[PDB]
């Protein structure tokens, strides 16, 4: 297929990737950058995040998945149905709200696309509604992350798709925060774009910290598989 070639082609070998974030959540404003690779032949992806404006107002957990679905692992044969590198080099918009059940709400928009070799995120969030001192502004998520499907569908209409999916934070007493996750995704060119029919992916998600690093970080490793087109 000479389409399922293009997109895919640049993604073969291991990637650079930059993540740019403008948060402001209650007002509490800040700013974070990201740096790594992905490797899309295993799904694979190695991130480091940098508060760049000091303390993170909000938990890193929070912001995992606002912070790559062009790297996922699509089996050969699930190749038609992958629309995140369709759209490449050209990009794509991602856009979410993201519901955190008794308290706030995010709501992002993101362009991924690439800038020379590099694949580049560029997000703006603004977070409202929030409780002071609720789970995320007062800060009572553990630093930890649970393996979630992602249900992928056509938006046929809007030439893009849409995505939706639950994620549970870990409380530090042992409950759970939910953030309820509503996406869509959109080419930024006018050409044409794989449109995919129902399927997943899985996501496996770890976090951790850099021994080295003083300033507020985060440390994410994620593989990333689509499935459920047997």
């Known amino acids: 297929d000479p389409m399922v070639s293009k997109g895919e082609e640049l993604f073969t070998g291991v990637v650079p990737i930059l993540v740019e974030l403008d948060g402001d959540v209650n007002g509490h404003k800040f700013s974070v950058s990201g740096e790594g690779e992905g490797d899309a ?3 694979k992806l190695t991130l480091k995040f940098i508060c760049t404006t000091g303390k993170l107002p909000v938990p890193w957990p929070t912001l995992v998945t606002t912070f790559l679905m062009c790297f996922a692992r699509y089996p050969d044969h699930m190749k038609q149905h992958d629309f995140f590198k369709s759209a490449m080099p050209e990009g794509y ?3 979410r709200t993201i519901f955190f059940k ?3 709400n995010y709501k992002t928009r993101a362009e991924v696309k690439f800038e020379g070799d590099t694949l580049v995120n560029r997000i703006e969030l603004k977070g409202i509604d929030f409780k002071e001192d609720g789970n995320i502004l007062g800060h009572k998520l553990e630093y ?5 499907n992602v249900y992928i569908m056509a938006d046929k209409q809007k030439n893009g798709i849409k995505v939706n999916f639950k994620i549970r934070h870990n409380i530090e007493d042992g409950s759970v925060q939910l953030a309820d996750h509503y996406q869509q995704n959109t080419p930024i060119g006018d050409g044409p774009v794989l449109l995919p029919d129902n399927h997943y992916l899985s996501y496996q998600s770890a976090l951790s910290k850099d021994p080295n690093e003083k300033r507020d970080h985060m440390v994410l490793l994620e593989f990333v598989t689509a499935a459920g087109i047997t």
């Open 93 to 95: 918009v991602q856009e």
């Open 144 to 148: 930890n992350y649970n393996s979630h």
């Open 102 to 104: 008794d308290d706030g």
């Open 41 to 43: 032949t295993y799904g």
